[PDB]
Amino acid sequence: RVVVLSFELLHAPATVCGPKKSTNLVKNKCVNFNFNGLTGTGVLTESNKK
Amino acid sequence: AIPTNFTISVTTEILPVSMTKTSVDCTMYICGDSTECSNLLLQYGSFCTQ
């Protein structure tokens, strides 16, 4: 019996997620973030984009 | 043919003397803010010292 899962990553809105517990957002600091699997580091802030 | 008068001509010529001084940071250009990449960049440090 064969099942082939097909998906794409870090390009569009995501509904299937891994079993990672979220965390309260921390802004204005050199933090390592993980938004829907997109890791990295930097400084978060708010803005207005359509 | 001998001149019998004259004109006092003022000519403008422009010469570039300098250009914008610039500096480059290897670490934050190549390996933006990730430590994993910057560790790999140590072995190429000599190149940046150039």
Chain A interface mutation, best of B27, B31, B33, highest count of A Cβ atoms under 10 Å:
B33
Contact B34 A42 (CB under 8 A): no
The answer, for A19 touching chain B at a CB cutoff of 8 Å, is no
Residue with tokens 């940071």: B25
User: Do the Cβ atoms of A34 and A14 come closer than 8 Å?
Assistant: no
What residues contact residue B2 under an 8 Å CB cut-off, 6+ apart? none
User: Do the Cβ atoms of B41 and B31 come closer than 8 Å?
Assistant: yes
Q: What resolution (Å)?
A: 3.0
What residues contact residue B41 under an 8 Å CB cut-off, 6+ apart? B26, B27, B30, B31
User: Do the Cβ atoms of A10 and A38 come closer than 8 Å?
Assistant: yes
Chain B residues within an 8 Å CB radius of A30: 33
What Å distances lie between residue A50 and A16, A47, B7, B39, CA to CA? 24, 10, 66, 37
The answer, for A42 touching chain B at a CB cutoff of 8 Å, is yes
